Design a protein around this ligand. Structure first.
Ligand SMILES: Cc1ccc(-c2n[nH]cc2-c2ccnc3ccccc23)nc1
Ligand SMILES: [Cl-]
Length: 309
């Protein structure tokens, strides 16, 4: 049958890189579009169910899609959430692999708020990358707001009742994305709130510069390449990353790298710090984003942009 979870008609495939295939779909009661993820039920790393629980735990958070359904059908488990738009990596690419200072500040404070809400719900994200932050759909009220998906790497960092932080430990696996992950992650250290925010700082410099200086490194093995990347991170001062850029971005990176393991980050201080960039430059925080000017003011286009995607 073409309909799963009673109410969701399967449409075209829209990717498969995480655990399972992802499809578009439509709610056959109201026509609202959805994203549908399939996980093979006979898998040794069951993950979809825990992701449904994470979405349900974050229900009501701005920028976190609703999960409408989870169930088993045939040989698959199925999860259904809101359908969103292109990722920030997509939009970055279509804007020529550089975002303006204003667009970086504006997405940064939204990304800080998203990660803050994750943290307030006792979770760390552990897979920060521009590919997992998505905008909305064309014409929607949240068309150009930033959203966060893919919680397969998320983990509880504190007991929900007592707020007791997990213990520090080392010899952790190097799971994550080497371009953005924190220095602590390279060193096999248990991640905490500070590591999500340091990865954000790397993403901010990536958007501003167009590249990070630890891209393009060579080594015979993935393990040795990750190590060289971590080495480069440890030997590149934030003011060097920030050459010719507003120094608030260096101050942010140094700050979150200095956070104690169990410390609560001052999220609003960080947001005010980056907002002061716009004051310095005489700009307004008015929601105008680089990608809104693509294609003559029309916005991103499926055959000009998303087809090279
Ligand atoms: C159940 C479920 C469905 C999808 C996803 C997902 N994973 N990565 C990106 C998306 C994703 C989410 C929402 N709208 C999209 C639109 C286009 C491309 C990807 C997405 N996760 C869980
Ligand atoms: Cl090796």
């Amino acid at each position: 049958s073409s309909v799963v979870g009673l109410h969701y008609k399967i449409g075209k495939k829209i990717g498969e890189g995480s655990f399972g295939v992802i499809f578009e779909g439509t709610n056959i009661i109201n026509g609202v579009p959805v994203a549908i993820k399939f996980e093979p039920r006979k898998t040794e790393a069951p993950q979809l169910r825990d992701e449904y629980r994470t979405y349900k735990h974050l229900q009501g958070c701005d920028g976190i899609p609703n999960a409408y359904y989870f169930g088993q059908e045939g040989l698959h488990n199925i999860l259904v959430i809101d359908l969103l738009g292109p990722s920030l990596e997509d939009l970055f690419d279509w804007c020529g692999r550089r975002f303006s200072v204003k667009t970086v500040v504006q997405v940064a404070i939204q990304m800080l708020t998203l990660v803050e809400e994750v943290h307030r719900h006792d979770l760390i994200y552990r897979d920060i990358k521009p590919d997992n932050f998505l905008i909305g759909r064309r014409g929607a009220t949240d068309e150009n707001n930033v959203h966060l998906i893919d919680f397969g790497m998320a983990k509880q960092y504190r007991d929900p009742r007592t707020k007791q932080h997990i213990p520090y430990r080392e010899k952790k696996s190097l799971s994550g994305t080497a371009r953005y992950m924190s220095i602590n992650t390279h060193l096999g250290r248990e991640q905490s709130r500070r590591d999500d925010l340091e990865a954000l700082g790397h993403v901010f410099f990536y958007f501003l510069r167009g590249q990070l200086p630890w891209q393009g490194l060579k080594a015979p093995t993935n393990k040795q390449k990750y190590e060289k990347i971590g080495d480069k991170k440890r030997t590149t001062p934030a003011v060097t990353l920030c050459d010719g850029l507003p120094q608030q971005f260096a101050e942010y990176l140094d700050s979150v790298r200095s956070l104690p393991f169990d410390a609560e980050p001052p999220y609003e201080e960080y947001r005010m710090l980056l907002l002061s960039v716009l004051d310095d430059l005489g700009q307004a925080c008015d929601g105008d984003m680089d990608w809104m000017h693509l294609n003559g003011g029309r916005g991103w286009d499926a055959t000009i942009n998303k087809k090279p995607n």
